[PDB]
Design a protein around this nucleic acid. Structure first.
Ligand SMILES: [Ca+2]
Ligand SMILES: [Ca+2]
Length: 294
DNA sequence: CACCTTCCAGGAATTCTTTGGCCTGCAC
DNA sequence: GGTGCAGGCCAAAGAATTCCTGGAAGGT
């Protein structure tokens, strides 16, 4: 179906997706190496439509339906990769994934000269794979004793469309219920984004760019990880909800968000204290997030 | 028959979600 | 014979995501 806005695309890619450089020796007597370039996303079936719309937008890559209960989009056809690179040069990433993507681009240029089939090709492309992702496997580590640091990237959030894309990937909207013996049962709206410590910068940018929220480190559970949380109702209703209302989310999360706002209006109309409306809230919370059923 | 690329399917590691509960300090 | 609540904190678990790999089907 439909295609996606470019910045929504880049944002969602910062959240999910991987750029990978395969370097595998030849099963043939050829003492050489075959080098593959792959950009692939793997999601729960709920969001398969996204995988389509990405395809529909790039018109490259294949979409495989897995038995894992997930769906995967792969782009490895060499010339098709141009599309990808063309995109992320006109709409760059901002998370640490940018680093990996850049190495991707680098590798592509090395293979574009068709020199990868050359000894020089092998020498350079390994120097690249060592830097991106988990680096070299043990085999390539023994075959190529070499010297390979890595500084953190600190880019600024481009716009709100990027945020709607990214949040559609890694954001969360939670309705917290605490029900003293008063029996009342309190309601609270939380908007959470969980990131690895390496993306601390992004987190910081988040607060300033939204002008609200608070960062909770989470190290007594080793992930590492840390969270960006917004719960103050003034900020949720005056700062968060309008953002994602004018820059719509994508994927099932949108529906979640919508139900979220249902709760938010009820909490604004003060109808959350009456038990009937509180029942309405409970019903919504029960049928969203992990509770929704597709 | 051979190189090489593009694809699928599998899978282990781990990074997200998503989920709660506890605490505190104002207003009143 | 302070207390109710909103705005914060503390975290866990599994599963959705991150990466990688083996094997083989398409083009020359
Ligand atoms: Ca992710
Ligand atoms: Ca997600």
């Amino acid at each position: 179906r439909e295609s996606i806005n470019p910045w929504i695309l880049t944002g969602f890619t910062d959240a999910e997706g991987s750029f990978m450089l395969r370097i595998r020796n030849t099963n043939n007597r050829s003492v050489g190496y075959y080098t593959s370039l792959v950009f692939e996303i793997t999601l729960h079936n709920k969001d398969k439509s996204i995988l389509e719309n990405i395809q529909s937008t790039w018109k490259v890559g294949t979409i495989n339906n897995r038995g894992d209960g997930t769906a995967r989009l792969s782009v490895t056809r060499f010339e098709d990769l141009k599309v990808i690179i063309d995109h992320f040069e006109k709409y760059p990433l901002i998370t640490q994934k940018l680093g990996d993507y850049k190495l991707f681009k680098q590798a592509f240029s090395v293979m574009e000269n068709k020199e990868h089939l050359k000894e020089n090709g092998i020498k350079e492309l390994v120097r690249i794979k060592a830097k991106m992702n988990w680096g070299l496997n043990d085999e390539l580590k023994k075959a190529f004793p070499e010297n390979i640091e890595r500084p953190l990237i600190n880019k600024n959030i481009p716009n709100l469309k990027w945020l709607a894309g990214f949040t559609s990937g890694e954001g969360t909207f939670y309705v917290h219920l605490a029900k003293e013996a008063s029996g009342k049962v309190y309601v609270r709206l939380r908007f959470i984004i969980g990131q690895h410590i390496r993306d601390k910068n992004l987190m910081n940018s988040l607060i300033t760019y939204l002008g609200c929220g608070t960062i909770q480190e989470k190290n007594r559970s080793k992930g590492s990880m840390l969270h960006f949380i917004v719960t103050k109702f003034s900020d949720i209703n005056d700062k968060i909800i309008p953002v994602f209302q004018e820059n719509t989310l994508i994927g099932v999360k949108l529906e979640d968000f919508e139900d979220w706002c249902k709760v938010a209006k009820l909490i604004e109309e003060k109808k959350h204290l009456t038990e009937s409306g509180l029942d309405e809230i409970k019903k919504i919370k029960l049928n969203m997030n992990k509770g929704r059923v597709f």
